Write a protein that binds this ligand. Sequence first.
Ligand SMILES: *[C@@H]1O[C@H](CO)[C@@H](O[C@@H]2O[C@H](CO)[C@@H](O)[C@H](O)[C@H]2NC(C)=O)[C@H](O)[C@H]1NC(C)=O
Ligand SMILES: *[C@@H]1O[C@H](CO)[C@@H](O[C@@H]2O[C@H](CO)[C@@H](O)[C@H](O)[C@H]2NC(C)=O)[C@H](O)[C@H]1NC(C)=O
Ligand SMILES: *[C@@H]1O[C@H](CO)[C@@H](O[C@@H]2O[C@H](CO)[C@@H](O)[C@H](O)[C@H]2NC(C)=O)[C@H](O)[C@H]1NC(C)=O
Ligand SMILES: *[C@@H]1O[C@H](CO)[C@@H](O)[C@H](O)[C@H]1NC(C)=O
Ligand SMILES: *[C@@H]1O[C@H](CO)[C@@H](O)[C@H](O)[C@H]1NC(C)=O
Ligand SMILES: *[C@@H]1O[C@H](CO)[C@@H](O)[C@H](O)[C@H]1NC(C)=O
Ligand SMILES: *[C@@H]1O[C@H](CO)[C@@H](O)[C@H](O)[C@H]1NC(C)=O
Ligand SMILES: *[C@@H]1O[C@H](CO)[C@@H](O)[C@H](O)[C@H]1NC(C)=O
Lengths: 41, 994
Amino acid sequence: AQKFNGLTVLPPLLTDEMIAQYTSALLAGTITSGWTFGAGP
Amino acid sequence: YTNSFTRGVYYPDKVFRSSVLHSTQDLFLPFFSNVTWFHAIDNPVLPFNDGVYFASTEKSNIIRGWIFGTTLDSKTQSLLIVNNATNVVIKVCEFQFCNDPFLSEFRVYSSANNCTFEYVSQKNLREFVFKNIDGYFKIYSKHTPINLVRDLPQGFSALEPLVDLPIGINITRFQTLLAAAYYVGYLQPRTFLLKYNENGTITDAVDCALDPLSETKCTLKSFTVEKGIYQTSNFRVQPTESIVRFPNITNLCPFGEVFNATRFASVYAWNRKRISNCVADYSVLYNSASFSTFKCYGVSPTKLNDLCFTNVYADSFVIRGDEVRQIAPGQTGKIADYNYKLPDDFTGCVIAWNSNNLDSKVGGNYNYLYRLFRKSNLKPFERDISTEIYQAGSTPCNGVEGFNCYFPLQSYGFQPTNGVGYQPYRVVVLSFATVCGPKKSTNLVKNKCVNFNFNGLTGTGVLTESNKKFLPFQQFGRDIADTTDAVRDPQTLEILDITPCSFGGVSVITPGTNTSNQVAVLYQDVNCTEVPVSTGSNVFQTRAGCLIGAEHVNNSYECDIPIGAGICASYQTSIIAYTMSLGAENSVAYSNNSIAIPTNFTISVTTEILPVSMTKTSVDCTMYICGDSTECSNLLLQYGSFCTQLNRALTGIAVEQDKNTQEVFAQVKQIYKTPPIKDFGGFNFSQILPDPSKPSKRSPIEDLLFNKVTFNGLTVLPPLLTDEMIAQYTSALLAGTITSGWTFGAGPALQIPFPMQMAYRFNGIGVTQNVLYENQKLIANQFNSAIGKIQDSLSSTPSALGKLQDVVNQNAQALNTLVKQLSSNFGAISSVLNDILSRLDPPEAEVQIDRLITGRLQSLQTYVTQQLIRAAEIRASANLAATKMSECVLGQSKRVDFCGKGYHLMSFPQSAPHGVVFLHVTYVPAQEKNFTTAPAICHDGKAHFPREGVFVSNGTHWFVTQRNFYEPQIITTDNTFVSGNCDVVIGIVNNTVY
Ligand SMILES: *[C@@H]1O[C@H](CO)[C@@H](O[C@@H]2O[C@H](CO)[C@@H](O)[C@H](O)[C@H]2NC(C)=O)[C@H](O)[C@H]1NC(C)=O
Ligand SMILES: *[C@@H]1O[C@H](CO)[C@@H](O[C@@H]2O[C@H](CO)[C@@H](O)[C@H](O)[C@H]2NC(C)=O)[C@H](O)[C@H]1NC(C)=O
Ligand SMILES: *[C@@H]1O[C@H](CO)[C@@H](O[C@@H]2O[C@H](CO)[C@@H](O)[C@H](O)[C@H]2NC(C)=O)[C@H](O)[C@H]1NC(C)=O
Ligand SMILES: *[C@@H]1O[C@H](CO)[C@@H](O)[C@H](O)[C@H]1NC(C)=O
Ligand SMILES: *[C@@H]1O[C@H](CO)[C@@H](O)[C@H](O)[C@H]1NC(C)=O
Ligand SMILES: *[C@@H]1O[C@H](CO)[C@@H](O)[C@H](O)[C@H]1NC(C)=O
Ligand SMILES: *[C@@H]1O[C@H](CO)[C@@H](O)[C@H](O)[C@H]1NC(C)=O
Ligand SMILES: *[C@@H]1O[C@H](CO)[C@@H](O)[C@H](O)[C@H]1NC(C)=O
């Protein structure tokens, strides 16, 4: 797992500060609404 | 001067091709290149580098011909083409040049000499192409109507071959003869991409090294590219200077006592000499006076004066001519066995010479003695000097020679009358840092990109002084995995580091061919400081790399083209780069005593597509590898049973692609039919039921789906079940689910009217049956509207059936690559077997056939291994379709999001060319409202709880309603149970119970 010799590592499309936002949104939705937000308004 | 607007293409070879794109790699005239506008109204001498483009335009026959040559004069061979009549002429003698060949004037050929071929035989542009390769002379031409005033028209048309000439005369000159327009251009090796039409004429072309868009087109093998990101080429930096640092000392090596020595020694007493601390000039020995030969093992004699060695050892001895062949590794003989032994890895040279004039005297010379037997073979580089009497028999001897005991040494009969096989010979062997060569030096550079040439070490890198603490005896520093990153100079004593040159990939971002024609490039993991000519006003640095050609904006969109690190690109209709936005901002007004309940609903339909099976293939071995040949088949039996295994694997794959269809579709024992009259309560099913007016007996949606998407020992097998049988199975399932509910998957089929079934399904989600019966017309209308929009949405953008198309494309790209691999040498002379045999005799024609067998065998194993991995992915998809059919078609599912987004009601299957399409029906609420709630009611010192519902309040009164649809009612003892007193619960309220 080193450089040279034509080996490269590409960065992921989504960072970690975005996965944190997604998981916070899911938590807020399940706390404040219940199971309703997954099947409509 | 003028440029060239896409002009000068010609037919490469004599092959007919139709409606196919091709890639060629020979000499052309690069697009948009500068040319010379010679005007004669004058004729100079122009060079000839690999090809010339010619053109002219005149209303009268001013242009006559050409005078080729290499050293044009009256002293060498030449070539002459002129047209002074209705005939042409060709000659290979000429040799009559002058300083003004302007020519019924014919003052060109003053003389003549040994002549050759006599092909004397039979405005507007007239373009020509001349090239001289492989000892043949070829020309091309075309004539077209034209009207212009200055340079050249637009458009293009290719040129066709005219003649050929096996001249063989080198050409390094070029002239012209007149009697207007006369252009000149040169040729260069490039790579193109040509398009043919049905009749077989070149009609378009694109270059590969003009612009990045052309590179993308060439790498994708198409003229139109859709939006996305692509990998095109690679990027690396070239060195600039050179460094040849070398040792300091200077002293000529002493070879006189080695090569020009006066008196030699005996072979059995060969001397050993050591040469060190010197600089040699080996090349002088390689010319000198050719002694006998210069056979060198391990190193090349020609490239010897650039290497530094650490110790040089030379041995000299005298032998005869016949024993010369024994001085080599892996040789046997008296000299090889008991006089001199060479190791099998000898890296040196052997020089010998005939010395009949110094080591031979009349009568024979007995000064030289050689050993002829010993107790054991000599080790390499071992000398024996003992002269003890050898015992060659059972009878012992003690220092006395005689019977069965002879002297170990014998003398040579070196007489001057002896033959060259018995004439004396002197042989010296060199067995190759201190002994360097005649090189030079150069000052050392820091922090630049150069290629270094140390003593036997070569490479490229950036040299920097580094804080590598060193024990004061070591030079070469290495990191993990054995990378050389430290050197010690041969002149000073300093420690450096070796770091490589920057490299990375290049990617191109495009918004589509039919949208615009501008691109942006992304140099991966490279800082925007080492990327010069590429250069522009827009240079932006990201985490992925350097982006050239896009601007930065401070507003967030929902992105389409991905780049990396949460950065995307788009088009404004002008390419912009920005940061992603996850979604809209929302917040629910949470409170301690507030609730929301819907007052209406909608019905939705959502589709889903799944692949099921792939195509069955079988490949024969002996036809693919050898092919109609009897000599090749014999050589393949010694490889064992490597071909039964492949057929077994492919057959195992093929059988499995026939139980997936059975597991998915064959789930009913009987075949059900729909009733003749269709009155189902207001619901219309004509878009999914089969029609009788069409021959295929398929529903309209199935018809739209089926219209939307579609040698060498390669075969394709047919499937077991046909499309008609699959259609019958689907129709049976639909009829059963319409006329019988869900009862036919768990026993006998039981009839039930459709609205009652729909009312049953409403009870499974939490809505009472009365809601359906009092809203029948609205639900029927919504359902009928939902079905009608599927056809239009599928008739929309063809990206709908993406999943099934990729299975067809992948299974066809792999089969094309396999056939194309039959036209490669794999390190041989020819790709066809009928020229290997018909040009070589069997003993060594067989080694060149085993090289084609190894390559053609491991190309088959790559094909079989990848097919197995792809057959494991489809079986996962097939097992997910069977589960969906049982749980979402033969029942009502309570699993969230398993089939549809919302609350499940029912589903219908439809058949696709290689998969299955589901149609999910789902309940969705709407039109919310606000209310106030309480958990319990206190009445006469008791606590009252709802049975199935929620307590609500309009502001002045209290009610009880169900949880999913607003329907208020009066609180009574019939819809309430009592438990405990009302001094424990939190949030209790006061009211009355009737
Ligand atoms: C069920 O829906 C189909 C839609 O495909 C209806 O068929 C169309 O009906 C309209 C007017 O009723 C005609 O103009 C079209 O030509 C019909 N298309 C066909 C026959 O392919 C069908 O009438 C509907 N049936 C009921 C009972 O409502
Ligand atoms: C809220 O809904 C109630 C439901 O009827 C209404 O308020 C009164 O309710 C009682 C019995 O529940 C009825 O006898 C009265 O006639 C209702 N009042 C009126 C003006 O109709 C009313 O619809 C709503 N009340 C308010 C204050 O908005
Ligand atoms: C419901 O009604 C009862 C009366 O039956 C209320 O109880 C009274 O509460 C007040 C103070 O709020 C006391 O001074 C009285 O002595 C209580 N009377 C009895 C008989 O307990 C009760 O507070 C009411 N609750 C609500 C939420 O209105
Ligand atoms: C050339 O192609 C056209 C259609 O593109 C066709 O009509 C014509 O017959 C062709 N000429 C031939 C086949 O000689
Ligand atoms: C050769 O290099 C320099 C001359 O510039 C000298 O000072 C140094 O001592 C010499 N090195 C050797 C190994 O002779
Ligand atoms: C609900 O919360 C409010 C404030 O958020 C506060 O009065 C109390 O915790 C609860 N109210 C009642 C009436 O229980
Ligand atoms: C409910 O929605 C339907 C269409 O979605 C509409 O026609 C109707 O007026 C709405 N209200 C009621 C009470 O049905
Ligand atoms: C009332 O309910 C509605 C339902 O969406 C909500 O938008 C609103 O914020 C609520 N108001 C209060 C005061 O709870």
